[PDB]
Amino acid sequence: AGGKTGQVTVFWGRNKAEGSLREACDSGMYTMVTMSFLDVFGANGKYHLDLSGHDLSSVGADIKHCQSKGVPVSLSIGGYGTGYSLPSNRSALDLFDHLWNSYFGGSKPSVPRPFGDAWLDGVDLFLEHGTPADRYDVLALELAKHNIRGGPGKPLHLTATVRCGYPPAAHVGRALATGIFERVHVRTYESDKWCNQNLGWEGSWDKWTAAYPATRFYVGLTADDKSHQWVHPKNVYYGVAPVAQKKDNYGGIMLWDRYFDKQTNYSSLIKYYA
Amino acid sequence: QSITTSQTGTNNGYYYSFWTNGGGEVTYTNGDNGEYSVTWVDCGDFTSGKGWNPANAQTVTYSGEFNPSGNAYLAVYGWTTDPLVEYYILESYGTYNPSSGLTSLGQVTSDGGTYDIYSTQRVNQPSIEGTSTFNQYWSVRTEKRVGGTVTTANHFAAWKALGLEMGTYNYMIVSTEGYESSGSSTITVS
Ligand SMILES: *[C@@H]1O[C@H](CO)[C@@H](O)[C@H](O)[C@H]1NC(C)=O
Ligand SMILES: *[C@H]1O[C@H](CO)[C@@H](O)[C@H](O)[C@H]1NC(C)=O
Numbered sequence A: 001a002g003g004k005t006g007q008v009t010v011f012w013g014r015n016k017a018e019g020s021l022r023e024a025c026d027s028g029m030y031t032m033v034t035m036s037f038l039d040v041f042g043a044n045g046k047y048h049l050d051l052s053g054h055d056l057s058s059v060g061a062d063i064k065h066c067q068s069k070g071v072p073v074s075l076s077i078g079g080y081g082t083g084y085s086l087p088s089n090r091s092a093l094d095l096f097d098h099l100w101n102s103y104f105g106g107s108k109p110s111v112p113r114p115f116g117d118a119w120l121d122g123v124d125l126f127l128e129h130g131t132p133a134d135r136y137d138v139l140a141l142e143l144a145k146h147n148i149r150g151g152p153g154k155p156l157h158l159t160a161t162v163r164c165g166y167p168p169a170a171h172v173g174r175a176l177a178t179g180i181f182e183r184v185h186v187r188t189y190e191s192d193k194w195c196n197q198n199l200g201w202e203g204s205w206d207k208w209t210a211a212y213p214a215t216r217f218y219v220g221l222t223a224d225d226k227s228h229q230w231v232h233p234k235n236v237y238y239g240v241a242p243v244a245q246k247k248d249n250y251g252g253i254m255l256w257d258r259y260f261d262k263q264t265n266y267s268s269l270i271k272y273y274a
Numbered sequence B: 001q002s003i004t005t006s007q008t009g010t011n012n013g014y015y016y017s018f019w020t021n022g023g024g025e026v027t028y029t030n031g032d033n034g035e036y037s038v039t040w041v042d043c044g045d046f047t048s049g050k051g052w053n054p055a056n057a058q059t060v061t062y063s064g065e066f067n068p069s070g071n072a073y074l075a076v077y078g079w080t081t082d083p084l085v086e087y088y089i090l091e092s093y094g095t096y097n098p099s100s101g102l103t104s105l106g107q108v109t110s111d112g113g114t115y116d117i118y119s120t121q122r123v124n125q126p127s128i129e130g131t132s133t134f135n136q137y138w139s140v141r142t143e144k145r146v147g148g149t150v151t152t153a154n155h156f157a158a159w160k161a162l163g164l165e166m167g168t169y170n171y172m173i174v175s176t177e178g179y180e181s182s183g184s185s186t187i188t189v190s
Helices: A021-026 A056-068 A089-103 A136-144 A170-176 A201-211 A233-244 A258-264 A266-270 B152-161
Strands: A008-012 A032-038 A073-079 A122-127 A157-163 A183-187 A216-222 A250-256 B007-010 B015-020 B025-030 B035-041 B045-052 B059-069 B072-081 B085-093 B117-125 B132-139 B147-151 B168-179 B182-189
Touching (some): A136 A157, A183 A201, A183 A250, B072 B152, B072 B182, B147 B152
16 A cells, blocks of 8 residues: 655745745755746747746755755746647757756756756656647656766656646656656646546546556645635545555655745645655 | 765776765765775765776775764665666665565675675666666675675676576676765775
């Protein structure tokens, strides 16, 4: 069966007033912070990082300070907009290159590094919008070549943040079929009919976990207490976490997000149940 | 001059690998003629040491001090490729046997003193080649020692005698490895 992992991933970047990346990390409430989002990328040199007017000139030192304290940091790409696509293999390698030379281990004169010498610990795929022509499989396999242990590099935690619905959209399914996704956060907190905490998530959870046995699965919850998909901490301890911990490839809990977590200290109670 | 993030190279005709996942403060330093030194404080995971890169089954002559305060390993450590393998010939360890809850297996005699054999699958884990699924073998010692001889030809041939394939050698060092601990270690290979 295999249960508690003590792992809590929290998203960050969706509102400046949620406080810095270093403040998140020093809360001692999260084992991984996923910055959010690289909301533009495609068949051109156009890339954009949206951190919602967040203090950019803090995050680089905070990444390193996070890593020292045992909290790795990844960057999620995509989001809820339609300003991104990856419609070719060449589009995917350009994405890798940009990611790599901007935020990871690469260094090229013609490519700036917003976070200085800080070197990120992973990439997340938040792919609300896409088509079957997308080549996130190409991105994923290249990223996986840089998930390094015992050599000149560091671990890269490759993940996908997906809608509750199984089976996933083609562009997500195509990437996941590479087999080398470390973790998948299933989001159970959206207003999606037939697939959220109020109705459908246990069934979605059953199929997801079975389809990718080599991948860890995080149950994705909202920390906004005013959402109808919010689950009281009591019911997490008693219902959500036990159910999800039935499956062998349970990895932990994902929380959307740091802004709403500061509003209700959801993780305080939740971290003991993860 | 000391380093603090992952890197490889050559130092006085020895291959050196130092890897860390970034956790804590791990400081690596190369000395002369096969020595290296690591001091660490609340690390996450790191490996470190000297050896040979395109490495034969070398007859390893090591010596020094290995003083973990917590969990750490001091093994003749290496990888193969095709198939991918990670092997440990564990000489000593800190506060935790790395074979904690593995189906007990053994054993093999070598260089005076005996060892123990284990095997276990790593699935979608980081490695020298990236995200992979491979076995990690062990040669644990039921008595700890820090210094002596480990003729790697005997450990390799004993695993292959039973049901565990190897592959082409890529690197083999005497690894000091910390896991969520502090400590210090100064090992010298020859
Ligand atoms: C959450 O807890 C922190 C300290 O852990 C405190 O500073 C903050 O005011 C709390 N906020 C809420 C919503 O309880
Ligand atoms: C993608 O296309 C590139 C050319 O840019 C090619 O070299 C590479 O092997 C392809 N990757 C895969 C395996 O789809």
